[model samples]
Target: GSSGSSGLEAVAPERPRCAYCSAEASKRCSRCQNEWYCCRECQVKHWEKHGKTCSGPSSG
Candidate 1:
């Protein structure tokens, strides 16, 4: 959190998207942190494809 955000500066949170369906996402995967999901079902569905190169979810 030491991200050096200015108190008055306006910063918009990046809008995440479901890794599979392309729907607007709100949940971040604990495993592959880069991937996001609208719900558990979507995450599970995408796991098969995403598992091969699963990497730590990164927050930049």
Candidate 2:
């Protein structure tokens, strides 16, 4: 048997973070791939502003 002293390390309570609302994020932008969002609704909403920076030569 193992002592399992590192048992606590196996637990990752931190869920993915959203780039917009700071909520639980699971989805990532397929283009930039730099940001994360919780849902399509939030992503779509953020796109209004993020779109300009998310793409174009200036982004890369």
Candidate 3:
């Protein structure tokens, strides 16, 4: 009996969650670590409000 190779299926990376909207996200900002966003729209929205007020270096 021949078993299928494990390589047949690709293991997808875990999709990151949006820091602001908590929506399913895949994009990340280079400046931050865990900060993730579903799209540019949400990122911009968050940046306009909470981003500027954020204190100290970003943990994410």
**lDDT score at residue 45, model 1, on the 0-100 scale:** 93
Q: Please say which candidate is ahead in lDDT: 1 or 2.
A: 1
lDDT of 2 by residue, 1-60 (tens): 566565455665766777679898987776687678998777788888878788544353
Better of 1 and 3 by TM-score: 1
Candidates, ranked, TM-score: 1, 2, 3
True lDDT of residue 33, candidate 1: 79
Estimate the overall C-alpha local distance difference test score of candidate 3: 0.70
Q: What residue runs in model 2 are displaced by over 4 Å at the alpha carbon?
A: 1-13, 56-60
Query: Residue 15, candidate 3: how far off, in angstroms?
Result: 2.4
Query: What is the overall TM-score of model 3 with all chains considered together?
Result: 0.50
lDDT (10s digit) by residue, model 3, range 1-60: 498575766677777788679899887755554367888887777886646554437664
Ranking by lDDT: 1, 2, 3
In candidate 2, list every pair of residues with a backbone clash: none
Model 1: per-residue Cα lDDT over 1-60, one tens digit each:
778756785677778899889889998777757788988898889889877677754444
**lDDT winner:** 1
List per-prediction Cα lDDT, in the order shown. 0.81, 0.75, 0.70
